[PDB]
């Protein structure tokens, strides 16, 4: 994940370590960087 | 074995020449990743002191065994006996950002702080001898030859441990000068 | 035991060879690196041999009289032009040292290529054999051939700022001259740069 | 008997950037949901290379206007991310916190001029250990460089390569004379068609492979 | 407003030892030293060497063989001696007030400082070492 | 050699200038003073040490400096200010105090 280098099932539950996440029913600046037109516009030579 | 001699091609005569036989060799203690894994104290040390090695004594077990190789790449392990917060910066960083308390900063503990900082210089493998004209004597190894700098208030002792060391291009090791007496006699 | 080494369009033939001593490798390492970004172009016209004079092997010279040559040395040839026009380049040193001897004069001369050469304290001269090296003796072989792969802290090193390989010749045994033998043994070299890659084209003066 | 831990004296204190986790003192809290919230960026380079920002030039302007006389050298700067021209860009803003960078740097020039005024420019990446050239020919079919003629598409992108000895290069250049660890990058106007008081806005981005490493914290 | 005077012979012959002297009296010419100058006709500025309290005379090399001075403090008078005048050497002799005192040393480079090298390389003649961690112009250290 | 202009002219009451132009080796580490030189007759310092003047100076002449050159300021140009004003700035190549040689100060 983040900086965390621990290699073990952490002691405390996720519920008590971090705050849980709700959902309703992404990463736009990577979609932008991927969608970028690389290369040329005219005929090479 | 009456070899060509001049060819300097490696020749290793066994003891099987005079009817004696060659025994079993267990060469662990003369390994490279093993002989450099011990702690080599750096003296004298003070605040705003770089953790770059070669400041190890030339004659120490880890100083001479290191200067016996031109190029050496290893992961440094530090042990510092400081008196305040000990800030450490990577290989290339402004000496101004030395104590911003955002760079790894080990808070003073009762015993010396022991860190395992990585090898961060941009080069492939550092060098013990550079033989290079002054960038843009020879006393000077490039500034990027360090493992980063530490600045605690009053640093009292500094030890250094080269993990996973790799030495290249061996050099002279130069055992102690003997004068008049046959053996050194210590 | 003849040996016809040939670099580029120039070849050297010796009839007293004693073999070739590759130092630290049998082949050069990958010439493609992230720093170059595939902008490095190999030059095959820089492999031509060049002859450089070395200290004369007088009888008076004592053991330990090292006469190192910095590599790369000033070059007025095609290789020299590349150093001037290219910021970064890498090559194999391939130093060849031949000292003509009458063969009736007995002496021992050790030629070794020392990477990152540092002035010796005269106690490391005995331990100077731990490098790619060959021994030049009039009794056995008058020519010593050493091939060394380019090795440096960076994949490409600017030659003007720093030189990785320096050729050093040491008088292991003082030359002894018989009446029949040569009274002085000049020493010459045949260096050739091998696997010359260049990158970073520089601006011009023309 | 109980377990004999035999705790080591040497380590166990607080490193600021250590990989550990704190001890949860508050019971579970379900924060409000934010699914697909617009505008999330994960890596600072996927944002830096996504949106280029301008450079600073004479009198603090983003563009480099056409020279007033024979002078063809419009503007030049060192490649170091700590250059004066790059002091206001986001790329150098995030490269401030990192120790050393590597790989490419795309420059974006977009001619902002009338339809009646054409011009033909040239950017040339000049390599370390040399003094950057006054006339455009000194750099032609020398170094790595390009040329673009303003037409219907104004923008032109030139990917300044990463040619250096070391695999990484320090971001904050500390002297080394005029030159930084990397070389210069100069922009020439080889011929302006009635292209006076007509500008060339210069931006800068991260390369397709630009990477920073070794985070650090200097007074910025 | 220290009391100065320029003095000497006015109508003299060329090719002799200029023997022109002044009286400079307040402290601004007594911790500071005496000045010797003239100006040539329809030309640019001219300067002649001068002496502080240390007895250390010095002159411009242009006429070194035919320039020589001394200093006196008691009579508030100082002496000038310039041999072998030429016709081209014509100007006003009235100024003798040389307030200027020498001092010379150059500060260190953009990243370099005095003992901020107390770290990488410590022993030697070049003391002003190197500060910011990283490759520097002279990363180890330098002399002034 | 130090540098200085050779021409000055003005009217009564207005502010005319005097300047002491130099360079790195002469001005940058050398103080500038200005002095009242009549045909044949005595001088007196006006501004000295850059920051001040002595008891005994009038406030009609004043000094300013900038970078590798210096300047004077002549407030209320007077018939008393009808003398050549000279100055010096130290030379470190031969250990001296290089002078700027003063002008013919004609009052209109």
- DSSP assignments along B19-40, one per residue: T---------TT-HHHHTSS-E
Query: How many CB pairs (< 8 A) connect B and E?
Result: 65
Mark out the alpha helices in C11-50 (DSSP H runs). none
CA distance B85 to B58: 30
Beta-bridge partners for E96: none
Q: Which fold has domain E4-82?
A: Immunoglobulin-like (2.60.40)
Nearest to A4 among D19, D31, D36 (CB): D19
**Quick check: do B and D touch, 3+ CB pairs under 8 A?**
yes
Contacts of A33 in chain D (CB under 8 A): 45-47, 49-50
Q: Residue F25, Cβ neighbours under 10 Å: how many?
A: 16
User: A17: which chain D residues are within 8 Å (Cβ-Cβ)?
Assistant: 21, 24
**Dihedral angle, C-alpha E93, E99, E101, E107, nearest 10 °:** -120
Q: In angstroms, how far apart are the furthest CA atoms of chain C?
A: 62
Q: Which of B4, B127, B136 sits opposite C153 (nearest CB)?
A: B127
Q: Which residues of E55-93 are buried (b: 16+ CB within 10 A; e: fewer)?
A: eebbbbeebeebbbbebeeeebbbbbbbeebeeebebbb
**Beta-strand pair F106-107/F9-10:** parallel
Q: Does B123 touch chain C (CB under 8 A)?
A: yes
Q: Which residues of D touch A20 (CB under 8 A)?
A: 28-31
Tell me phi and psi for residue D65, to 5 degrees. Answer: -75, 160
Domain ranges of chain F: 1-108
End-to-end C-alpha distance for chain F, whole angstroms: 31
Residues ≥6 apart with Cβ < 8 Å to B116 = B75, B77, B78, B163
CB-closest option in B96, B98, B143 to E130? B143
H or E element, residue D94: helix D90-95
For testing the chain B interface, which of E118, E119, E130, E142 should be mutated: the one with the most B CBs within 10 Å? E119
**What helix, strand, coil percent values describe chain F, rounded to 5?**
5, 40, 55
E92 closest CA partner among F99, D125, B48, D91: F99
Q: Which residues of B touch D176 (CB under 8 A)?
A: 135-136
C-alpha B53/C-alpha B64 separation (Å) is: 12
Neighbours of chain A (3+ CB pairs under 8 A): D
Cα B37 to Cα B74, D62, F38: the distances in Å are: 10, 54, 86
Beta bridge partners of residue B152, listed in sequence order: none
Q: Classify each residue of A27-44 as buried b or exposed e, where b means 16 or more C-beta atoms within 10 Å of its C-beta.
A: ebbbeebeeeeeeeeeee
- Cβ-count burial D143-181 (b if 16+ within 10 Å, e if not): bbbeebebeeeeebbbbbbbbbbbbbbbbbbbbbeebbb
Gyration radius of chain A's alpha carbons: 21
- At B115, list the tokens: 């860190």
Q: Which residue of F has its CA nearest to E101?
A: F90
Q: Say which residues have a Cβ less than 8 Å from residue E131's Cβ, sequence separation at least 6.
A: B95, D174, E111, E112, E113, E116, E117
Hey, where are the domains in chain E? 4-82, 105-144
Strand partners, B115: B78
Query: Virtual CA dihedral for C190, C195, C196, C198, nearest 10 degrees?
Result: -170
Q: What is the DSSP letter of B147?
A: S
Instruction: Provide the sign of the torsion angle of the four alpha carbons C96, C99, C102, C104, taken in this order.
Output: negative
- From chain B, the residues in CB contact with E139 under 8 A are 135, 140-144
* Method used experimentally: cryo-EM
How far is D64 from D57, CA to CA, in rounded Å? 7
**Is C in contact with D (3 or more beta carbon pairs below 8 Å)?**
yes
Under 8 Å between Cβ of E58 and F97: no
Burial E21-36 (b: 16+ CB within 10 A, else e): bbbbebebbeebbbbb
If you measure CA to CA, which chain C residue comes closest to B10? C21
Query: What residues of D are in contact with residue E132 (Cβ under 8 Å)?
Result: 172, 174
Strands E4-7 and C10-14: unpaired
Q: Which residue of D has its CA nearest to B123?
A: D166
Chains linked to C by 3 or more Cβ pairs within 8 Å:
B, D
Sequence spans of domains, chain A? 1-45
Facing residue for B141 by CB, picked from E119, E124, E140: E140
Q: Across the interface, do C24 and B129 touch by the CB < 8 Å criterion?
A: no
CA of C68 vs chain D CAs: smallest distance (Å): 26
Which chain D residues are within 8 Å of C203, Cβ to Cβ?
126, 130, 132-133, 138-139, 142-143
Task: Count other Cβ atoms within 10 Å, centred on residue A13.
Answer: 10
Residue C87 touches partner D, C-beta closer than 8 Å: yes
Please indicate whether, in this complex, the C-beta atoms of A21 and D33 are within 8 angstroms of each other. Answer: yes
Do chains D and A have 3 or more beta-carbon pairs under 8 angstroms? Answer: yes
Q: Is the separation of the CB atoms in D95 and D212 below 8 Å? A: yes
CA of B141 vs chain E CAs: smallest distance (Å): 7
What pairs with residue E73 in β-bridges?
A: none
Enumerate the residues of chain D whose CB falls inside 8 A of the CB of residue E111.
Answer: 174-175
Take residue C138 and report the two structure tokens written for it. Answer: 């009039």
For this experimental structure, what is the resolution in angstroms?
A: 3.5
Please, what is the end-to-end C-alpha distance for chain B in angstroms?
A: 36
Query: What is the C-alpha separation between F69 and F17, in angstroms, rounded?
Result: 14
């Amino acid at each position: 994940s983040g900086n965390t280098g621990s290699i073990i099932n952490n002691y405390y539950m996720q519920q008590y370590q971090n705050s849980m996440d709700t959902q309703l029913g992404n990463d736009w600046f990577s979609k932008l960087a991927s969608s970028a037109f690389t290369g040329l516009f005219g005929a090479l030579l | 074995t009456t070899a060509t001699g001049e060819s300097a091609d490696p020749v290793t005569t066994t003891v099987e020449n005079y009817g004696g036989e060659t025994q079993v060799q267990r060469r662990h203690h003369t390994d490279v990743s093993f002989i450099m894994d011990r702690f080599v104290q750096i003296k004298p040390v003070s605040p705003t002191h770089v953790i770059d090695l070669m400041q190890t004594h030339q004659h120490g077990l880890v100083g001479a065994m290191l200067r016996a190789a031109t190029y050496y790449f290893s992961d440094l392990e530090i042990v510092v006996n400081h008196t305040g917060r000990l800030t450490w910066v990577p290989n290339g960083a402004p000496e101004a950002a030395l104590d911003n308390t955002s760079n790894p900063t080990a808070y003073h503990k009762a015993p010396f702080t022991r860190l395992a900082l990585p090898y961060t210089a941009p080069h492939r493998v550092l060098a013990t001898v550079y033989n290079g004209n002054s960038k843009y004597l020879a006393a000077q190894l490039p500034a990027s030859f360090n493992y980063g700098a530490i600045r605690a208030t009053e640093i009292q002792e500094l030890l250094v441990r080269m993990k996973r060391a790799e030495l290249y291009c061996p050099r002279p090791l130069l055992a102690v000068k003997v004068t008049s007496q046959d053996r050194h006699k210590q | 035991r003849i040996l016809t080494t040939r670099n580029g369009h120039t070849t050297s033939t010796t009839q007293s060879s004693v073999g070739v001593t590759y130092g630290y490798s049998t082949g050069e390492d990958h010439v493609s690196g992230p720093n170059t970004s595939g902008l490095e172009t190999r030059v095959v016209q820089a492999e031509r041999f060049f002859k450089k004079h070395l200290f004369d092997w007088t009888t008076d010279k004592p053991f330990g009289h090292i006469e190192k040559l910095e590599l790369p040395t000033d070059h007025k040839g095609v290789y020299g032009q590349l150093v001037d026009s290219f910021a970064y380049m890498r090559n194999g040193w391939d130093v060849e040292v031949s000292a003509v001897g009458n063969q009736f004069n007995g002496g021992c001369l050790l030629v070794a290529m020392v990477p990152e050469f540092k002035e010796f304290t005269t106690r490391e001269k005995y331990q100077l054999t731990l490098f790619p090296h060959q021994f030049i003796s009039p009794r056995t072989n008058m020519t010593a051939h050493i091939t060394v792969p380019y090795l440096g802290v960076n994949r490409y090193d600017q030659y003007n700022k720093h030189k990785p390989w320096t050729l050093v010749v040491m008088v292991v045994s003082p030359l002894t001259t018989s009446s029949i033998g040569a009274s002085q043994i000049k020493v010459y070299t045949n260096i050739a740069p091998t696997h010359v890659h260049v990158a970073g084209e520089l601006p011009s003066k023309e | 008997g109980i377990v004999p831990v035999a705790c080591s004296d040497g380590y166990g204190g607080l490193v600021t950037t250590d990989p550990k986790t704190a001890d949860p003192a508050y019971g579970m809290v379900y924060n409000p949901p934010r699914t697909n919230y617009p505008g999330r960026f994960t890596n600072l380079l996927d944002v830096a290379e996504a949106c280029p920002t301008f450079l600073c030039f004479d009198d603090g302007k983003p563009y480099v206007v056409t020279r007033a006389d024979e002078q063809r050298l419009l503007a030049k700067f060192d490649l170091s991310l700590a250059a004066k021209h790059m002091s206001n860009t986001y790329l150098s803003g995030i490269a401030q916190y990192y120790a050393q960078y590597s790989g490419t740097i795309n420059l974006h020039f977009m001619f902002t001029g009338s339809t009646d005024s054409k011009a033909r420019y040239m950017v040339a990446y000049v390599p370390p250990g040399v003094t950057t050239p006054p006339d455009t020919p000194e750099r032609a079919a020398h170094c790595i460089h390009a040329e673009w003629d303003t037409g219907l598409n104004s923008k032109f992108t030139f990917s300044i390569p990463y040619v250096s000895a070391a695999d990484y290069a320090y971001t904050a250049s500390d002297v080394a004379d005029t030159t930084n660890v990397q070389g210069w990058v100069c922009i020439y106007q080889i011929t302006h068609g009635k292209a006076e008081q007509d500008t060339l806005v210069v931006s800068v981005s991260a390369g397709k492979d630009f990477e920073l490493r070794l985070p650090i914290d200097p007074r910025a | 407003q220290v009391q100065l005077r320029e003095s000497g012979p006015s109508l003299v012959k060329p090719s002799q030892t200029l023997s022109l002297t002044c009286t400079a009296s307040g402290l601004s010419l007594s911790d500071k030293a005496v000045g010797w100058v003239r100006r040539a006709p329809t030309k640019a500025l001219e300067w002649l060497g001068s002496i502080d309290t240390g007895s250390s005379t010095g002159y411009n090399p242009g006429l070194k063989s035919r320039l020589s001075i001394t200093k006196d403090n008691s009579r508030n008078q100082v002496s000038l001696t310039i041999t072998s005048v030429t016709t081209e050497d014509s100007a006003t002799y009235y100024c003798a007030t040389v307030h200027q005192h020498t001092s010379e040393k150059r500060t260190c480079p953009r990243a370099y400082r005095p003992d901020c090298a107390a770290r990488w390389d410590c022993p030697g003649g070049a003391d002003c070492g190197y500060c910011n961690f990283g490759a520097g112009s002279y990363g180890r250290c330098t002399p002034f | 050699v130090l540098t200085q202009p050779s021409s000055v002219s003005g009217s009564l009451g207005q502010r005319v200038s005097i300047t002491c132009s130099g360079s790195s080796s002469n001005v940058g580490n050398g103080y500038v003073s200005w002095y009242q030189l009549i045909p044949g007759s005595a001088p007196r310092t006006l501004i000295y040490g850059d920051t001040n003047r002595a008891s005994g100076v009038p406030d009609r002449f004043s000094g300013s400096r900038a970078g590798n050159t210096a300047t004077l300021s002549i407030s209320s140009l007077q018939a008393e200010d009808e003398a050549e004003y000279f100055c010096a700035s130290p030379e470190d190549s031969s250990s001296n105090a290089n002078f700027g040689s003063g002008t013919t100060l004609t009052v209109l």
